Every structure is written in C-alpha cells, then in structure tokens.
Swiss-Prot record, chain B:
The active site is at H119. Belongs to the PPP phosphatase family. PP-1 subfamily. Keywords: Acetylation, Carbohydrate metabolism, Cell cycle, Cell division, Cytoplasm, Glycogen metabolism, Host-virus interaction, Hydrolase, Manganese, Metal-binding, Nucleus, Phosphoprotein, Protein phosphatase. Mn(2+) 1 binds at D58, H60, D86. InterPro entries: Calcineurin-like_PHP_ApaH (IPR004843), Metallo-depent_PP-like (IPR029052), PP1_catalytic_subunit (IPR050341), Ser/Thr-sp_prot-phosphatase (IPR006186), STPPase_N (IPR031675). Mn(2+) 2 binds at D58, D86, N118, H167, H242. One of its GO terms (molecular function) is cadherin binding involved in cell-cell adhesion. The modification Phosphoserine is found at S16. It comes from the Eukaryota. This is Serine/threonine-protein phosphatase PP1-alpha catalytic subunit. SUPFAM superfamilies: Metallo-dependent phosphatases (SSF56300). The keyword Magnesium does not apply. CDD domains: MPP_PP1_PPKL.
C-alpha cells in the first residue's frame, strides 16, 4: 500500500 | 581507506535507540563506493557460491534491523552472507545500511556477497527515498557515485549448483545461464528484457505460464514455470526476494521457490516479519525471524 512499484 | 574505523563507527550504535545516525565523511563513502565497485567488476556477474551461508532479502534502509540480522546470524565473517538486493529506499537509514554492506564486501570479498535489486537503480531510488537522503545528508554528487557502484552489482547467484538466487524472479528470455554471464557492466536496469525480469518479476498462484505484472513492468510466472526451470537446469530451489510476505519468508510451488523479505514492519496494510534463511552444509534450509513489533 506504499505505492505497487511495493503493502 | 580506514575500513576498520568505518566499520567500528557504523557498529558503534548497536544498542542505541533505533534511528541514531552514523555520519561517515563524504570521502569515506566515496572510497567505499569506488573500492566495492572494483571488486564487483572483478567477480562474475553470475556468482557461484558454497554453503553454509545466510541469505537475506529486502532491507530498504532499516539499519537497526540489519544490525539485528547480524546479531542473530553472526557478524561477518563469523557467517558467510548473500544479500538479494533492495538495500535503499523507504527506510530512514539507507545510507548507514548500504555503507555497512559495502564495507563488509570490501573487508570480506570472498565471504560476503550482494546482489542487485530493482531499487539499486537511479530511476527508482530517485523517487523512493535514496536520492532525498543523499541530498539531505551529503550531496547529489555522492548519489551519482552510489549509482555508478550500483550499476556494477552482480545479478544472480547459484549456491552449490542447486539454489538459483536473484532479486525478482524468472524471465521468459532466460534459456541458458550463459545469457546472464554475457551481461556487461556497468549497466542500468532496462524497462524490459532479461535483466529487467531478474530484478522485477513475481511468482503468482493464479497464473498459468507467463502473465502481466501489476507493477507495470516485467511479468508474473506460475508454479509450472518454476518446475520446468528447476528440471531443465538441474536445480532444487529458487530463492528470491522483492515481495513483502507476512511471515518474512514464503514458499511457492511445493517448496520449489521461496521468497525472503528481511525488513519487518515495512507495510501499513498488514504486519510482516523479516526472515533470514540459513543454508547448512547439506543445503537444508531453516529460518531466523525478526517478528513484527
Ligand atoms: Mn524489489
Ligand atoms: Mn523491495
């Protein structure tokens, strides 16, 4: 969920 | 280069409250980059390693968890180590993390090994934190010096002719190990092709063959791709990193592939542990785990 380049 | 002084100062903060910095000099960090770069270029791009050894996945600047990993596994050279990449970005201490890793590579170049992850690439770590850390704590000239070093990291490793290791995963273009050995350095990571896939691809339980990858680059691959690759190259196991897994390690395709992720508490959508894999003298695999906070 951090942004799917990636939780 | 006073390597021992550098290592001592990096280790000095063991037992401090997490977050306490180690600020090496610009000249020391440049020496670490230049010397490690020469060692990377003198060793093969496809490493051939021997167990026993410890294998770690992503660290992402979580320096105090790197220190815990060494506390659990033994500080170099008490144990041999292979890291699978993604040393920088996201975490608050990418600089301490990569400097200790490079210092140990120079100090124990035959017993300590680092692979390239997709974040050891200027296009990625420009935007995911490492550029900002370098600009804040040093200058952008040092970030370029890091980039030159990252562009020379090896790409894959085979442990005792049985465990194939890389950061991301398999490639539809990977037919022979000689294709990896032919890759020339320095290189950037391309946005497609063999080198891209080795650093970016993912296994997927719901894909048959090769699929599209939600990251926007490279591919996914299924359990049958793994089995055929293992059979074709006479391997027992694929060991890779790159994906956050809740237990720190996660098996795939009937334990023919394992994902390692070594940075605990990385992710806001779910808790995760960090794991380090022990490979013993018979190639049996076990785990040491940093449980989530
Ligand atoms: Mn990655
Ligand atoms: Mn990562």
């Amino acid at each position: 969920x951090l942004x799917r380049x990636x939780x | 280069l006073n390597l021992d002084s550098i290592i001592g100062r990096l280790l000095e903060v063991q037992g401090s409250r997490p977050g306490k910095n180690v600020q090496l000099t610009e000249n020391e960090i440049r020496g670490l980059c230049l010397k490690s770069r020469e060692i990377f270029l003198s060793q093969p791009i496809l490493l051939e390693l021997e167990a026993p050894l410890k294998i770690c996945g992503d660290i992402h600047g979580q320096y105090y968890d790197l220190l815990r990993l060494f506390e659990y596994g033994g500080f170099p050279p008490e144990s041999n180590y292979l890291f699978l990449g993604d040393y920088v970005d996201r975490g608050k201490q990418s600089l301490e993390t990569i400097c200790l890793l490079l210092a140990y590579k120079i100090k124990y170049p035959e017993n300590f090994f680092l692979l390239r992850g997709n974040h050891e690439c200027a296009s990625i770590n420009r935007i995911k934190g490492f550029y900002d850390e370098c600009k804040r704590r040093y200058n952008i000239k040092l970030w370029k010096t890091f980039t030159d070093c990252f562009n020379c990291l090896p790409i894959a490793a085979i442990v005792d002719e049985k465990i194939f290791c890389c950061h991301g995963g398999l490639s539809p273009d990977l037919q022979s190990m000689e294709q990896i050995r032919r890759i020339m350095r320095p290189t950037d990571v391309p946005d497609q092709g063999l080198l891209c896939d080795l650093l970016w691809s993912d296994p997927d339980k719901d894909v048959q063959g090769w699929g599209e990858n939600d990251r926007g680059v490279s591919f996914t691959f299924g359990a049958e791709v793994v089995a055929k690759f293992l059979h074709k190259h006479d391997l027992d196991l694929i060991c890779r990193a790159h994906q956050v897994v809740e237990d720190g390690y996660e098996f795939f395709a009937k334990r023919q592939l394992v994902t390692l992720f070594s940075a605990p508490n990385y992710c806001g959508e779910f808790d995760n542990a960090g794991a380090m894999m022990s490979v013993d003298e018979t190639l049996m695999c076990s785990f040491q785990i940093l449980k989530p906070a």
